[PDB]
Amino acid sequence: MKNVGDLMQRLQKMMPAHIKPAFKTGEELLAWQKEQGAIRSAALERENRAMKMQRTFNRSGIRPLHQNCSFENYRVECEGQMNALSKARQYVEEFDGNIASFIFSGKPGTGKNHLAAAICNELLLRGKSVLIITVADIMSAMKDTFREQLLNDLSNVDLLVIDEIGVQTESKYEKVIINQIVDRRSSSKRPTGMLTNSNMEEMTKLLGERVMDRMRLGNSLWVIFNWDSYRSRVTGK
Amino acid sequence: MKNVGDLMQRLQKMMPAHIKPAFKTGEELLAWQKEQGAIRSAALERENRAMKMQRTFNRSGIRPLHQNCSFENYRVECEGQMNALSKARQYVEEFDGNIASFIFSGKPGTGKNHLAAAICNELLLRGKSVLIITVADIMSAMKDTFREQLLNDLSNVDLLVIDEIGVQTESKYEKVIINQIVDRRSSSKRPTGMLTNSNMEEMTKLLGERVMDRMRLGNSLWVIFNWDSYRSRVTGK
Amino acid sequence: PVVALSQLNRSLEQRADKRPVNSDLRESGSIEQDADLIMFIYRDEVYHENSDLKGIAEIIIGKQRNGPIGTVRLTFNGQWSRFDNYAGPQY
Ligand SMILES: [Mg+2]
Ligand SMILES: [Mg+2]
């Protein structure tokens, strides 16, 4: 039928010539493939890590209005939060291995979630995980457990911060939820945080003195705003 | 069991002459089927589009009075809403990718829901998704939950517009609900809309200043009416 | 080649999604191991009347011995019984 010389003489006619095999033996081939493989694996690993990092970005509940968001796009007008940013930068710097939790407060339209999202992005770039939530999402999750990844996460992330803690006046539930959370967090030597629009005394009757005591570790970071709104400027860039 | 020509002679006991078959081979038939397929598929796609469109229009719960309802069937009689039209038209024209929120307020019989429904019609002609509601229907939805789709549509939709905000003086719950909605929305770079009968001051103790902070973005559109009624004149064609 | 039809077990309907996958046919899985190519079918205008995929079926591939997997869109006009190519957008 056909054999080696005839086979290869068939083979060359498919193509343009001067296409020499370039290997000529076996061990050269094996070495070459080992080399290509160790070249390929590295870029593969790189890509896999990049995936992981994207999965951590998309998991946090930061909404788009605080996504294109950081320290540097935050406009100063006085000392009243020049102090705050001199606090926030060092907080991000002093975060690694630190029971350093915080609270913000004051007036709306004052850059709370903005600074929070800035912190969150910077700690994602440090290689650490974050999350920000509306408390009603925890409500809905506790109701939907009758249908655990989330509640598991909420007691094992490095950082956590909270939004909309004032409203839901139908209390005798919010206090106990957040107390359970903060106990399980503080116990594991991990921080957390909060956001609100009310005074500490206006907060403490909702949130019994124990919880705020658990906030009062390390060199804490209390803030109380006085600034005015910002909304008139923003247009949704 | 029968010859070809004689099979056909069996065949011609059915129809007349002048019925010639035109195929003459196979691959030509495949070309013919391909033609008909590329035709019927695109026509089907057209019909599918029209369906999806109607599935929107029957879902934006609007009551039939304000359905045959546009800018044009709105008999202008003074400037007080000539300005309203000059604003609503440009609101539509500016809706394309913007944080453009509006509020209406004033007296009944002055064309609030009329202009709202005209707006919604035009935006659906642009190919968007909207919805209007009665606040009691949101109450009813949250109760049906305690017997998700409609619940989560109120943040998966581009635009919402809200109706009958003053009534249900069983307050202190309405506020937390509307707060929840509007925070999820305005944090998500999307508009909304309100409707009422009261001044902003009266409105503000119902709706704490934070909500209107979430309202006053971009070139936020406040409007307030003062016209007299129209209801004695209307017929319902 | 060979072409051999089969059937499926009704433990999929209660899933409330209703796309088929590999672990849905329960005939010991003796054919899942023997085969070379599989093509499940889904067609939305059965399990719903108003769903906006009228006149469309789709070809969920679930195994490929010599290639990759995918998913394809095709139409159905059941009164003269022939699928046709879907010249349109992607899925
Ligand atoms: Mg906030
Ligand atoms: Mg009305």
The DSSP line for chain A is ---HHHHHHHHHTTS-S----S--SHHHHHHHHHHHHHHHHHHHHHHHHHHHHHHHHHHS---GGGTS--STT----SSTTHHHHHHHHHHHHS-SS----EE--S-SSSSSHHHHHHHHHHHHHTT----EEEHHHHHHHHHHTT--HHHHHTTTSS--EEE--S-----SSHHHHHHHHHHHHHHTT---EE--SS-HHHHHTTS-HHHHHHH--SS-EE--------TTT----
A19 to chain B, any CB pair closer than 8 A? The answer is no
Alpha carbons within 13 angstroms on the beta-carbon side of residue A141 total 14
Question: Which domains, from first to last, does chain B contain?
Answer: 57-222 (3.40.50.300)
CB A78 within 8 Å of CB A110: no
Pairwise CA distance, residues B172 & A170, whole Å? 9
Chains contacting B (3 or more CB pairs within 8 Å)? A, C
Ligand nearest to the CA of B231: 2
Chains contacting C (3 or more CB pairs within 8 Å)? B
Q: Packing angle between helix B113-125 and helix B79-94, nearest 10 degrees?
A: 30
Check the CA dihedral B107-B109-B112-B115 and report its sign: negative
Size of interface B-C (CB pairs under 8 A): 36
Q: B179, A197: Cβ pair inside 8 Å?
A: no
CB B187 within 8 Å of CB A179: no
Q: C75, B55: Cβ pair inside 8 Å?
A: no
Q: B40, C77: Cβ pair inside 8 Å?
A: yes
B183 to chain A, any CB pair closer than 8 A? The answer is yes
Q: C87, B38: Cβ pair inside 8 Å?
A: yes
**Structure's resolution in angstroms:** 3.9
Pairwise CA distance, residues A225 & B157, whole Å? 34
- The chain B residue lying nearest C54, using CA atoms, is B48
- The chain B residue lying nearest A63, using CA atoms, is B188
Q: Cα(A225) to centroid of ligand 2, in Å?
A: 39
Alpha helices, H only, B104-218 = 113-125, 135-144, 149-156, 174-186, 200-206, 209-215
- The chain B residue lying nearest C49, using CA atoms, is B51
Q: B44, C75: Cβ pair inside 8 Å?
A: yes
Q: A235, B183: Cβ pair inside 8 Å?
A: no
Nearest to B103 by CA among B224, B213, B219: B224
Pairwise CA distance, residues A52 & B134, whole Å? 44
